[PDB]
Structures are given as C-alpha cells and as structure tokens.
Design a protein around this motif. Structure first.
Motif, mmCIF file in Angstrom:
data_model
loop_
_atom_site.group_PDB
_atom_site.id
_atom_site.type_symbol
_atom_site.label_atom_id
_atom_site.label_comp_id
_atom_site.label_asym_id
_atom_site.label_seq_id
_atom_site.Cartn_x
_atom_site.Cartn_y
_atom_site.Cartn_z
ATOM 1 N N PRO A 15 44.975 51.512 49.896
ATOM 2 C CA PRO A 15 44.105 50.634 48.822
ATOM 3 C C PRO A 15 44.577 48.991 49.035
ATOM 4 C CG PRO A 15 45.795 51.404 47.838
ATOM 5 C CD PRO A 15 45.734 52.185 49.083
ATOM 6 N N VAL B 56 50.572 48.596 44.132
ATOM 7 C CA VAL B 56 49.261 49.010 43.278
ATOM 8 C C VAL B 56 50.007 49.195 41.935
ATOM 9 C CG1 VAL B 56 47.601 50.311 42.884
ATOM 10 C CG2 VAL B 56 47.936 49.752 45.040
ATOM 11 N N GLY B 63 41.432 42.392 26.475
ATOM 12 C CA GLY B 63 40.582 41.256 26.745
ATOM 13 C C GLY B 63 40.360 40.754 27.943
ATOM 14 N N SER B 64 41.023 40.916 28.840
ATOM 15 C CA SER B 64 41.070 40.747 30.250
ATOM 16 C C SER B 64 39.935 41.786 31.043
ATOM 17 C CB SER B 64 42.227 40.744 30.965
ATOM 18 O OG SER B 64 42.149 40.732 32.554
ATOM 19 N N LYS B 65 39.576 41.393 32.296
ATOM 20 C CA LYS B 65 38.531 42.163 32.700
ATOM 21 C C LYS B 65 39.030 43.255 33.581
ATOM 22 C CE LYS B 65 34.944 40.019 34.001
ATOM 23 N NZ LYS B 65 33.825 39.603 34.469
ATOM 24 N N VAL B 66 40.367 43.086 33.813
ATOM 25 C CA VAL B 66 41.227 44.190 34.731
ATOM 26 C C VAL B 66 42.108 44.818 33.732
ATOM 27 C CG1 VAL B 66 41.192 42.868 36.856
ATOM 28 C CG2 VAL B 66 42.847 42.474 35.278
ATOM 29 N N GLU B 70 43.499 49.085 38.179
ATOM 30 C CA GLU B 70 44.527 49.163 39.179
ATOM 31 C C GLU B 70 44.216 48.002 40.059
ATOM 32 O OE1 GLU B 70 44.065 53.079 40.435
ATOM 33 O OE2 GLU B 70 45.573 53.881 39.080
ATOM 34 N N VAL B 71 45.089 47.366 40.220
ATOM 35 C CA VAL B 71 45.065 45.810 40.977
ATOM 36 C C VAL B 71 46.082 46.102 42.164
ATOM 37 C CG1 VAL B 71 44.272 44.478 39.198
ATOM 38 C CG2 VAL B 71 46.656 44.577 39.776
ATOM 39 N N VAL B 72 46.024 45.094 43.345
ATOM 40 C CA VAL B 72 46.733 44.971 44.084
ATOM 41 C C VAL B 72 47.338 43.616 44.366
ATOM 42 C CG1 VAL B 72 46.913 45.316 46.951
ATOM 43 C CG2 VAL B 72 45.480 46.747 45.636
ATOM 44 N N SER C 1 35.053 41.345 26.097
ATOM 45 C CA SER C 1 34.522 40.247 26.799
ATOM 46 C C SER C 1 35.440 40.254 28.414
ATOM 47 C CB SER C 1 34.217 39.158 26.190
ATOM 48 O OG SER C 1 33.850 38.022 27.236
ATOM 49 N N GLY C 2 35.205 39.065 29.095
ATOM 50 C CA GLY C 2 36.048 38.707 30.230
ATOM 51 C C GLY C 2 35.108 37.945 31.221
ATOM 52 N N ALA C 3 36.275 36.748 31.685
ATOM 53 C CA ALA C 3 35.628 35.815 32.335
ATOM 54 C C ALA C 3 35.498 36.214 33.880
ATOM 55 C CB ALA C 3 36.370 34.546 32.131
ATOM 56 N N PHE C 5 36.658 36.184 37.726
ATOM 57 C CA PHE C 5 37.802 35.674 38.496
ATOM 58 C C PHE C 5 37.204 34.721 39.520
ATOM 59 C CE2 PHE C 5 39.068 39.676 36.610
ATOM 60 C CZ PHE C 5 40.358 39.635 36.438
ATOM 61 N N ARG C 80 37.783 38.758 48.184
ATOM 62 C CA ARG C 80 38.654 39.616 47.586
ATOM 63 C C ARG C 80 38.120 40.111 46.244
ATOM 64 N NH1 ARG C 80 43.828 40.393 45.300
ATOM 65 N NH2 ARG C 80 45.235 41.664 46.604
ATOM 66 N N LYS C 82 40.174 42.070 43.805
ATOM 67 C CA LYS C 82 41.236 41.991 42.848
ATOM 68 C C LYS C 82 41.650 43.543 42.678
ATOM 69 C CE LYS C 82 41.605 38.507 40.552
ATOM 70 N NZ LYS C 82 43.101 38.266 41.121
ATOM 71 N N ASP C 83 40.916 44.408 42.963
ATOM 72 C CA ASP C 83 41.625 45.959 43.519
ATOM 73 C C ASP C 83 41.970 45.851 45.009
ATOM 74 O OD1 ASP C 83 38.918 45.610 44.268
ATOM 75 O OD2 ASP C 83 38.183 47.481 43.051
ATOM 76 N N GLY C 84 42.425 44.783 45.624
ATOM 77 C CA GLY C 84 42.639 44.694 46.887
ATOM 78 C C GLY C 84 41.433 44.751 48.042
#
Ligand SMILES: COC(=O)c1c(OC)cc2cc3c(c(O)c2c1C)C(=O)[C@]1(OC)C(=O)C=C(OC)[C@@H](O)[C@]1(O)C3=O
Ligand SMILES: [Mg+2]
Ligand SMILES: [Mg+2]
Ligand SMILES: [Mg+2]
Ligand SMILES: [Mg+2]
Ligand SMILES: [Mg+2]
Ligand SMILES: [Mg+2]
Ligand SMILES: [Mg+2]
Ligand SMILES: [Mg+2]
Ligand SMILES: [Mg+2]
Ligand SMILES: [Mg+2]
Ligand SMILES: [Mg+2]
Ligand SMILES: [Mg+2]
Ligand SMILES: [Mg+2]
Ligand SMILES: [Mg+2]
Ligand SMILES: [Mg+2]
Ligand SMILES: [Mg+2]
Ligand SMILES: [Mg+2]
Ligand SMILES: [Mg+2]
Ligand SMILES: [Mg+2]
Ligand SMILES: [Mg+2]
Ligand SMILES: [Mg+2]
Ligand SMILES: [Mg+2]
Ligand SMILES: [Mg+2]
Ligand SMILES: [Mg+2]
Ligand SMILES: [Mg+2]
Ligand SMILES: [Mg+2]
Ligand SMILES: [Mg+2]
Ligand SMILES: [Mg+2]
Ligand SMILES: [Mg+2]
Ligand SMILES: [Mg+2]
Ligand SMILES: [Mg+2]
Ligand SMILES: [Mg+2]
Ligand SMILES: [Mg+2]
Ligand SMILES: [Mg+2]
Ligand SMILES: [Mg+2]
Ligand SMILES: [Mg+2]
Ligand SMILES: [Mg+2]
Ligand SMILES: [Mg+2]
Ligand SMILES: [Mg+2]
Ligand SMILES: [Mg+2]
Ligand SMILES: [Mg+2]
Ligand SMILES: [Mg+2]
Ligand SMILES: [Mg+2]
Ligand SMILES: [Mg+2]
Ligand SMILES: [Mg+2]
Ligand SMILES: [Mg+2]
Ligand SMILES: [Mg+2]
Ligand SMILES: [Mg+2]
Ligand SMILES: [Mg+2]
Ligand SMILES: [Mg+2]
Ligand SMILES: [Mg+2]
Ligand SMILES: [Mg+2]
Ligand SMILES: [Mg+2]
Ligand SMILES: [Mg+2]
Ligand SMILES: [Mg+2]
Lengths: 62, 397, 131
Positions: A15, B56, B63-66, B70-72, C1-3, C5, C80, C82-84
């Motif tokens: 990933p 990962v 409130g955040s979009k993520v 799962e992020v890297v 909500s969400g802004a 990136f 990118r 942000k999930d890689g």
RNA sequence: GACGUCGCUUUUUGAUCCUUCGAUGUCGGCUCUUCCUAUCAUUGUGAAGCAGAAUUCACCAAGCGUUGGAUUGUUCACCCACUAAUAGGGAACGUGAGCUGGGUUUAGACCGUCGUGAGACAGGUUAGUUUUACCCUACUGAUGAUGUGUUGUUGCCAUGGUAAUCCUGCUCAGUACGAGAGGAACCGCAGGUUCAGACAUUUGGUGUAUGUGCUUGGCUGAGGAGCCAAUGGGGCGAAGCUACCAUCUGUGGGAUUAUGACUGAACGCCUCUAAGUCAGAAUCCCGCCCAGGCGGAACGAUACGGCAGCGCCGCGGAGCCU
RNA sequence: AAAUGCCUCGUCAUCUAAUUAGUGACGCGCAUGAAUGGAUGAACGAGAUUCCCACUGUCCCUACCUACUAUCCAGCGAAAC
RNA sequence: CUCUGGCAUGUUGGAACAAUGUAGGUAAGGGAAGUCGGCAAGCCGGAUCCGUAACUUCGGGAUAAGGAUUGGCUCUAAGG
RNA sequence: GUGAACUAUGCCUGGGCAGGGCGAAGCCAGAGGAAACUCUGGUGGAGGUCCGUAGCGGUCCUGACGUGCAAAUCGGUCGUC
C-alpha cells in the motif's frame, strides 16, 4: 490495508508503492513501478514480456 | 527608491551564522523545566539514524476527512541501545549563569568511553581514570568521595548524568563512544542524587526514558552539502538566460549608501552541516531488539497484531548505508535531520501537549519492510521465494 | 464535514484543458484560480477540485468570448491521495459551473476525481464514475 | 468646511549654480536587501447620520503582507482577474567591473516640415562593439591567533541574530439583531496560503554505476567477444543528489501602549489621576531557536628502563638577572 | 493617424478575459500626393511588424549529469594600479 | 569509420571533483504566462507513394499546406 | 619628396567552382477535329534558376574572448555558390 495486483506485470502492489492510472473510459490500472507503467503506455504485451506472471502462466513455467 | 513589488525575505535571519556546526553530536541547549512534584527521570537520549520506511495506520480524528480510514505515513528509524550512566555532574546557579560545581565518575569505566577521552587510542597507553578508580577502591579516597556527594547535595541545584552510548552493539565502523549530559528532573536534589548514584555504572533503556506515542524533539546536525552558491543556499531567483557574468547570483547586494554589504543579503558559502532543533516529532513505536529465549525471536519488532508474521524492522538487504538494527529502536513520524549513521539527540518536549493532534494514541496496521536498495517488491525472504518458487541455484543446490 | 487536503497542482494559468460536459464547449483556457493570493512571479495554478476562471477557445459562439467559472475534474499530473496511492489521469478536463457550484451542463463524459466529487455534490451527481 | 489664515514635507516641477568637465557611466525593467509612515489589510481600541451585515472617521501601531496578466521602452496609465489587501514612499530620482540595451544620445538610411544650400528638428522610423577585480575594506563562509604549565572531555552564557503569517469550510446558526430583506461573534473542530527549517520511505527528475537489453555506420577473416562515431543513438535503471513536482515540523511568558476602568482628592459635589491600584495588544523585551568573548567552570591524563626527566614537601642554602 | 498626424493611446469595426500593439475602414491631411514620382503588385529578402498552429527549461521553478576551468600541489611566472 | 602515409593532443604535468563560469545534455505537469521582442533552444528534416489553396507578371507560388510508408530475412516477376 | 606588398578600380595573362531539385525552346509518337489546331506521353536541358559542398562572404547569439590565440580572433547559426 488492501493489496492490489499490478495491471501489467501482475505483481502484488503493497500500500505505499506504485502509481494508479485512470483512463477516460472509466477503467483504472495499477502499476508497481515506472517500468511496468512505461511498458503499458507503450502498449507492449505482458504475455510477450518474459518476466511477467501472464507470460509465465502462458508458457507454463509454474 | 522603492523596490516596486513586494516580495518576502529569502531565507531566515534567525538561523545565521550559516556556518559548519562546531559539534557533531547536537547540544540540547535547553532541558525541560524542573518541578520536584514529579518522579525522578531523565529528559533526553542518544540514538542513531538507521533509515526511513513507511507505515499504515488507522486515524481517529473526529471531524477530519481521514477519520476511521487508513493512511500511509513516512517514519524514521532511530537505533537506541541502552545508555550507560558512568558519571554525574552538579551545577549551581550564580548571577553569572549556571556553573558546574563538581563531577563524580564511577569505578570501571568502559573502553569505548575512554576511547571518547582519547584522540588516538592506538598509540595511547590507555591511562585515563586509573588514578581515579584507585581512589574509588581506596578508603581514604572513599570518604573524600562521599564528602563530595554530600557537598553536592547541600549546594547544587541542577544535577545531570553523564551517560555514553555503547557502540559495540551497533553496525557502525565507529568504536568510540558518545558521551552526553542528560538532565535529571523531578525531585529534591538529595532524592535525584541518590537515584542517580543508584543508577551509576549502569544501563538505562529508552523504554525507561521515553514512552509510547508522545511527542519529543530531535536535535542534530543537518546533512552536509559543502560550499554552495546563493541559488542553492538561499533559494534566490535565477537570473535570465542572457546574463553576462553568471546566472546563479544575486544581482544587487545593497544600495549605494549604506556603503557596505549588509549582513542580510544572500551570499555564497557553506550549506548544510548545521545544528538544528526540530520539535513535535511523534513517537510511533519503541522496538524491543533481538532477545534470545530459545531458538530466538525477532517478531517483537515489526509484528503489528494485524499481520502476525515473523519479520523484523529491517528491510530486505538491510538498511541502505547503515547496517541492521539488532537493538531497541524508536520509530518517529516524519523526516529527521542528518545522514544515515548520524547521532541524534532526542529529548522530551518543553511545551505541554494538550492538542488533539497530540495526546493521540496510535495503532499500527502495517510496517513496510520492502528493500530500499531499489524498487523492492517483497516484504520477507519467505514471501519472495514462495512467490518465485525454486531458482537455478536452489535447484543445483 | 471535512476540508480538502493539499494535492499537487501542476495546472498553471495558461493551460488549455478540455471541457468535459455537454454544454457545447470543447476547450477551457484557464486565466485564474479562485483563492490564490499568490507571490511574486509565481504563476497561479489549479488542481482537481479547484474553481478557475476560464475562457472557451473553440466551442459554441454564444460561449466563446466570455469568462466562466469552471471546476477542474481531471488532471494529468500525479497527486498523492493520503492512503499512499499516487493517481493521475489521461487528460486534463474541467466543467463549466456557476458561482454557487451548479453545472451549466447536465452530463459529464468520463471519470471524475474523488477530490472534487466530495467537494461539489452537484458535479458528483452528474458524473458517471468516481475514480 | 466657503470666505480667510497658520504650517509641515522634499516621493512633483521650478528657482539657484556651491561641488564635479586631466570624466562620479545618463532612462526603464529584472534581481536583492534594508529603512520610513503620511496604515490598504491584519492585532487591540474609541466614534458614527454604528440595529445586523457592510462602511466611514480617528488612536497605539510599520510585526507581517501587499499578487498574476493584455498594451506601451516606458516611470506614469488603463483594463482583465484573483485577493485579507492589492497602501504610499526612501536608500547618488538604491542598484550597468550585477545584467539587459527596448528608449534616449555618435557615425548608415528613409519620410514630413524648414532652409537656395551645406544642414536642422527637444517630429516619426530602422540598423547600430556595454571592457577590467588578482588590491584594500565590507560581506559570506574557512583555517588560525591571545592567556589558563601541556593536552583532552564534558559544559556555562556575556553578547549578536531571531519568525512565523494570513485565510477558508463545519459548528455556533439561519440564532442574536432586524417589520422584512437579510444577517453576525466567542469557544471548539478540520484544513489551506505565504514564509522558514529540513528530508528522500514513497511519486517524479537526473543518470557515464558507461549497470543491462536493443539498434545504425565502420573495424577486428567469420562465429563468439568487443571496440570506434569528442557521452553513436535509444529503452529501462541501483546508489547518490534533488521538487510545494513527494514528505515532515514551525512554540511560551513579562512589563506595558492606545483604550476601558477602581478608589479618590484638588474644587465640603464630581472626576481613570494628582498620590495609589486593575485589565490590556500582529508592538516592545525575553524565552524557544542559531552563533558562542583577548569570558569563565568541573573533571581526566600528565613524558626512563634507564641516567632521566618532572611534580610535591624545605626557607634548605648560596646567589644571579628583570 | 502610413517609415509621413502635433492634438493622439484620433473615432468605428475586428483580433484578446483584458491590446498605447496589429489589421480593415474614416478624413479640412500640424505638415500626403503624382519621374522632389503617385497607386499597385506575383516572385524574392541573414530587411521592419502583428496574429495563429506545432514545439519547447523562455518561464511557473528549479534540479541533476558530463567535459574544460576555477581549487590544491611541482616547475615557471607577468600586468593594470 | 578504416588502409597507405603521418602524428603525439598543439608552449607543462600530478591530485581532487566546491561555488561561479565556458561548452554540451536531460527534465514531471503546463506550454511564451518569460521578454522590448519566441532571444536562445526546441520542433521539422532523407527518400517513395498520394495530395496540394489564395494570389499571380500564367513563369510561379510549391518540398505550399496535409497524410501514409521505411528494419531484417526468404522468395517471385520484369528489364540484356 | 616616398608609397597601389594592404585596399579601391581598369587592363593583360593564368587557375578554379561536388552532388541533387524545377524542367524553357527545339524534337518524336499516339488520340480527337473540316480546318485552325487541340490533348496526352516521352525526349531535351535553358536559367544574373532553387537546395547544398569547396570557395567567397559575414546575419544572429548583441555567444566565447575582451591586460585575448588575435591592435578584430574563435564557435555554432547563417548569405551566396
Ligand atoms: C552617442 O553614443 C555614444 O556615446 C557613442 C557610442 O555609443 C555606443 C559609440 C561610439 C562609437 C564610435 C564613436 C563615438 O563617438 C561613439 C559614441 C559617441 C567615434 O567617435 C569613433 O571613434 C571611436 C570615430 O571617431 C569614428 C566614427 O564615426 C565618425 C565612430 O564609428 C567611431 O569609430 C566609434 O567607434
Ligand atoms: Mg513597497
Ligand atoms: Mg550580452
Ligand atoms: Mg531507495
Ligand atoms: Mg515578473
Ligand atoms: Mg550644478
Ligand atoms: Mg555666485
Ligand atoms: Mg563633468
Ligand atoms: Mg576625477
Ligand atoms: Mg570612472
Ligand atoms: Mg562609481
Ligand atoms: Mg501613526
Ligand atoms: Mg521580523
Ligand atoms: Mg539611479
Ligand atoms: Mg555598481
Ligand atoms: Mg557596465
Ligand atoms: Mg537600441
Ligand atoms: Mg565621435
Ligand atoms: Mg563611422
Ligand atoms: Mg544616425
Ligand atoms: Mg525646398
Ligand atoms: Mg530606435
Ligand atoms: Mg544588424
Ligand atoms: Mg585564485
Ligand atoms: Mg538575546
Ligand atoms: Mg544506456
Ligand atoms: Mg553493428
Ligand atoms: Mg576474429
Ligand atoms: Mg557478432
Ligand atoms: Mg581507430
Ligand atoms: Mg529515465
Ligand atoms: Mg516541498
Ligand atoms: Mg491610564
Ligand atoms: Mg497590569
Ligand atoms: Mg499581560
Ligand atoms: Mg505608423
Ligand atoms: Mg503581443
Ligand atoms: Mg490602418
Ligand atoms: Mg535582408
Ligand atoms: Mg586535451
Ligand atoms: Mg603532452
Ligand atoms: Mg605548437
Ligand atoms: Mg517539462
Ligand atoms: Mg512531458
Ligand atoms: Mg511571449
Ligand atoms: Mg507576454
Ligand atoms: Mg510580464
Ligand atoms: Mg532563433
Ligand atoms: Mg505560402
Ligand atoms: Mg515489411
Ligand atoms: Mg597589386
Ligand atoms: Mg543561382
Ligand atoms: Mg558554404
Ligand atoms: Mg564569426
Ligand atoms: Mg558579443
Ligand atoms: Mg541560393
């Protein structure tokens, strides 16, 4: 942690690596690296490139 | 007159004499503030930059979009074997500042510590601290030493512990150890003095100094670039293609009439090898090293409770230009100054972390151990050879 | 909500992208990017999800000689996510909208980036696929 | 703020001719730094013909920012567009051994007007060599010097620098306010711009690892292996370097300014003020961070296998120079 | 409103998101004009100008690589001022 | 590129591979927004087969513009 | 008084200038017309003709250099051939 398969070589893309190419036809593709990417955009045949899983499964190397 | 279009200042004037650092380690220059209500603890540590990889994890940021996705994230690996406390220094604060009152060292100081004390260990007779450990084993010297301890207890305000790294556990060419003063915080001077003399001649692990998912500061020496021009050194605009005596210059250095080049215009010189102090570096994981219970085990490194494999933190082919990590490591979030093998001072923060960006408990899903010596595509040797099957050398073997 | 990136921009002012809806425009010629305070000599640039001021260079004559707000929906430059994963498209494409985000057209040809589909709900409704 | 009247400024143009004609490179732009404040925005306020929103007038205030283009050599200008705002200036009308050379302003040439003419034009046009730093200082980095007997390690901080900035979206809330139309704010949350310092896991760039394939012409009798073509071309490419073209990080107090007040006289009343108190800010000072003084500290080791030095304990002695 | 027009960035149209530029018109033209030649030209031009397509490090916004320098050394060894 | 012939790299060498240069390359995404001005660089390029506009002094324009093909190997015809 | 050893121009006598493109007049044949003639295919090889060597020149980079290799040179790009 979804693992995808490379569209050209058929390797496992972990990933953090590679790139993803969306075409205007709605079909998206995943490339492990720029070697696979450049071979795809130059329209090579993965069953003709020796180091791909498609080649090795066609030629029964497994 | 009137530069006719506003543009901000190129580069920072809070960072210059933009010269080579006078030290290689990285001085703390400010320890955390002392409050005797806390327990007795250390405030800094000394690690070595191994390399980078990425992870990962699943984010819990409402409130955040993520949120709940799962992020890297890139991480830096710092090898931190336990540091040996071998000495103790006390400081008294004067109206001229803060001066060192008395140092006391221990009996049986190690050879890498004495290697730090020598500039040519090969041609030396290795005589350092011999007459000192004589007075440790004596009895007239012994009452002198406890008298020094008692005087330090009744007069000093700041005590620090002299600890060295043990380089025999590292994959590096350097056998000479690194010494460091680490401030002891949280107690009365008598309490922290008996605590430190308990910890004298002894090992202290990064597990005891730091903790999981706290935000620390990294102090080090920026990667070295040599003599650079103003375009690399200050990021000034390149001059147009048809410029007679060079493009990569600053076209005007000051007006006519301050009649001098000011200290604030961009000049060519040394870039890199700079002492920097970066803050808010989040610890992602504290490793555990290569313990031997039986036929030994390395899963206590990057086995993340969602893969359950038997892989270490080390990639395939090891860490490029470093070696391999067989000691306790610290995984930090993000990038960190210096080359590989560069020694990093790590210290506790001196702000207070009340932020939801901070005070956040993390949980790793995956740690990438593909080879960094190319575009590596396998995590473990077993995975690689199971994907490929038998090879020609394996067949003839 | 969400802004949203930050993504990689790679679509400066002088760019000509193709109009991706049924309004009758073919080209969009960017002249501006909504929300750019800017810097000396730096060209204002856009990415997917950005509202731009655009002219249409070839297309219908009742569209051609004007300034319209447009939204960039596909960029050839990789960004990118942000999930890689790094993602890029085959073309550069945007659609003509009004000031509050309603599409002038009614149907979008081709994939629409997720970074603009979550920002513009009226654009994502008319989309065929969200890549 | 009419009729009047008192000033300041030297970013306008004059007036003058003191300096320079054995020469101070003459417009504009580009680049880059710093300063000013007569403040456009942002911080904190007071006023309104300030209900809200928007705006206007003042105060402390120059910390921080003040853009991308079309046309013109232009400074000015005008328009398109974005923006929190697109403020105004100075530094030999900053800046040509920094550039550029479009204009002006040598010699070639054309036109118009003027002149009999040679020629003129602060009228238009076109083509027209922009030289030198290796000296001193300044500045940027780099060794070193000065005392502590020598030498090393660990440290302190005098002093100098200094840094963060602005904006959206959600919630507050379609609430306060307002007949209605419209329409806020604080706390909080999520991100972004500009700047700063890094960094290379990933994505991209480079690529003479001259790494490995392909390929043109020639050459080594062919094969095989190779070489030459000032890197033969091209594909992919490790390491390293490197990009808001990837990623990470960017912070705390104190005294207070404008202002709003407390107690309270002067002036048996009142009054933020006279004595005495309070709250108070993108300011200022410090912290954090960078450097570390002809500035200090703590501690280590301190010279032979031989005549061979050194240190300490002597008032222990005899004297010499300074 | 030309290599000739001060006023002048003349007025209208076109070209652009925007044009003191360009082109097409207009003409009481400071001060155009008929071998002091007027008006036209196909072909041609290391001639001046404007726009479009393609193309690109000209730029956004810089980076990396190679050769020769610069650098350090051995020998040699000036000048301007 | 090579043979005959000629030479010793153009009045020195060695070691490193900083800035700034000089000469040569490459560059994601945009594509003149740069600049007085596309300056400089880049694009195009040979040949074969098609196909070529306005305008014109009827000669030209013209390689206008635009498109396709191109290697290696094995043959088959035709041309004395 | 001395110079046309550079250069300017006339004269005399010598030397020199790949490879390609376009395809003028003249000519041959076939076809259509009552003639006048017309059409088609070849042939031919003209030109202060075109691309482009040697040669001659010198556009632009306002490139290098600018106490130079040089008291005017060098490189790429160019003009003509
Ligand atoms: C007005 O702009 C100038 O400042 C200027 C200039 O700006 C670049 C260049 C020049 C160039 C020159 C001259 C200039 O005067 C001159 C001037 C004034 C001369 O006088 C020259 O001698 C040197 C001479 O005597 C014979 C010639 O013409 C008779 C010239 O060509 C000359 O040879 C030359 O090169
Ligand atoms: Mg200004
Ligand atoms: Mg020049
Ligand atoms: Mg790697
Ligand atoms: Mg500019
Ligand atoms: Mg005067
Ligand atoms: Mg006088
Ligand atoms: Mg004078
Ligand atoms: Mg003088
Ligand atoms: Mg002078
Ligand atoms: Mg001067
Ligand atoms: Mg003021
Ligand atoms: Mg500041
Ligand atoms: Mg000036
Ligand atoms: Mg100067
Ligand atoms: Mg000059
Ligand atoms: Mg000129
Ligand atoms: Mg003259
Ligand atoms: Mg002359
Ligand atoms: Mg003249
Ligand atoms: Mg006359
Ligand atoms: Mg001129
Ligand atoms: Mg010329
Ligand atoms: Mg030198
Ligand atoms: Mg200070
Ligand atoms: Mg290669
Ligand atoms: Mg070959
Ligand atoms: Mg052979
Ligand atoms: Mg062979
Ligand atoms: Mg050879
Ligand atoms: Mg490549
Ligand atoms: Mg960046
Ligand atoms: Mg007061
Ligand atoms: Mg107070
Ligand atoms: Mg306060
Ligand atoms: Mg004109
Ligand atoms: Mg133009
Ligand atoms: Mg006209
Ligand atoms: Mg010409
Ligand atoms: Mg050579
Ligand atoms: Mg030689
Ligand atoms: Mg010679
Ligand atoms: Mg590019
Ligand atoms: Mg590209
Ligand atoms: Mg342009
Ligand atoms: Mg322009
Ligand atoms: Mg411009
Ligand atoms: Mg050119
Ligand atoms: Mg033509
Ligand atoms: Mg074929
Ligand atoms: Mg003669
Ligand atoms: Mg000819
Ligand atoms: Mg020639
Ligand atoms: Mg030349
Ligand atoms: Mg030149
Ligand atoms: Mg010719």
């Amino acid at each position: 942690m979804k693992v995808e398969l490379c569209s050209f070589s058929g390797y496992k893309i972990y990933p953090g690596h590679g790139r993803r190419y969306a075409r205007t036809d709605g079909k998206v593709f995943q490339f492990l690296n720029a070697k696979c990417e450049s071979a795809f955009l130059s329209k090579r045949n993965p069953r003709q490139i020796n180091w791909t899983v498609l080649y090795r499964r066609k030629h029964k190397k497994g | 007159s009137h530069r006719k279009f506003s543009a901000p200042r190129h580069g920072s004037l809070g960072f210059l004499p933009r010269k080579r650092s006078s030290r290689h380690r990285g001085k703390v220059k400010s320890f955390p503030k002392d409050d005797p209500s806390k327990p007795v603890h250390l405030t800094a540590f000394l690690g070595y930059k191994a390399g980078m990889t990425h992870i990962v994890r699943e984010v819990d940021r409402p409130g955040s979009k993520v949120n709940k996705k799962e992020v890297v994230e890139a991480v830096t690996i710092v090898e931190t074997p336990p540091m040996v406390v071998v000495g103790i220094v006390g400081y008294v604060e004067t109206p001229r500042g803060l001066r060192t009152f008395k140092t006391v060292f221990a009996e049986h100081i190690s050879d890498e510590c004495k290697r730090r004390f020598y500039k040519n260990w090969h041609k030396s007779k290795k005589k350092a601290f011999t007459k000192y450990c004589k007075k440790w084993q004596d009895e007239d010297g012994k009452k002198q030493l406890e008298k020094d301890f008692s005087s330090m207890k009744k007069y000093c305000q700041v005590i620090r512990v002299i600890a060295h790294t043990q380089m025999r556990l590292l994959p590096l060419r350097q056998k000479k150890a690194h010494l460091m003063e680490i401030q002891v915080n949280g107690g009365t001077v008598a309490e922290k003095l008996d605590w430190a003399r308990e910890r004298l001649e002894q090992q202290v692990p990064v597990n005891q100094v730091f903790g999981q998912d706290e935000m620390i500061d990294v102090i080090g020496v920026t990667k070295g670039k040599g003599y650079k021009g103003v375009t690399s050194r200050w990021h000034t605009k390149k001059l147009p293609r048809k410029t007679h005596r060079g493009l990569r210059k600053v076209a005007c250095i000051g007006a006519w009439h301050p009649a001098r080049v000011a200290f604030s215009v961009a000049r060519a010189g040394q870039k890199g090898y700079h002492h920097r102090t970066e803050i808010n570096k989040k610890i992602y994981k504290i490793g555990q090293g290569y313990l031997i219970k039986d036929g030994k085990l390395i899963k206590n490194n990057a086995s993340t409770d969602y893969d359950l494999s038997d892989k270490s933190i080390n990639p395939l082919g090891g860490f490029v230009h470093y070696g391999e990590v067989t000691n306790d490591f610290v995984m930090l979030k993000g990038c960190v100054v210096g080359t590989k093998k560069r020694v990093l001072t790590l210290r506790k923060s001196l702000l207070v972390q009340t932020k939801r960006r901070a005070l956040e408990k993390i949980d790793l899903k995956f740690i990438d151990t593909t080879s960094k010596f190319g575009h590596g595509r396998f995590q473990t040797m077993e995975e690689k050879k199971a994907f490929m099957g038998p090879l020609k050398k394996d067949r003839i073997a | 909500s969400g802004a949203k990136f930050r993504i990689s921009l790679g679509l400066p002012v002088g760019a000509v992208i193709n109009c991706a809806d049924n309004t009758g425009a073919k080209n969009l010629y960017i002249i501006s990017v909504k929300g750019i305070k800017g810097r000396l000599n730096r060209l204002p640039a856009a990415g997917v999800g950005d509202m731009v001021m655009a002219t249409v260079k070839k297309g219908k004559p009742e569209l051609r000689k004007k300034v319209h707000p447009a939204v960039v929906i596909r960029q050839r430059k990789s960004y990118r996510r942000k999930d890689g994963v790094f993602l890029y498209f085959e073309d550069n494409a945007g659609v003509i909208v009004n000031n509050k985000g309603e599409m002038k057209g009614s149907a979008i040809t081709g994939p629409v980036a997720k970074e603009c589909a979550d920002l513009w709900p009226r654009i994502a409704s008319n989309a065929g696929s969200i890549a």
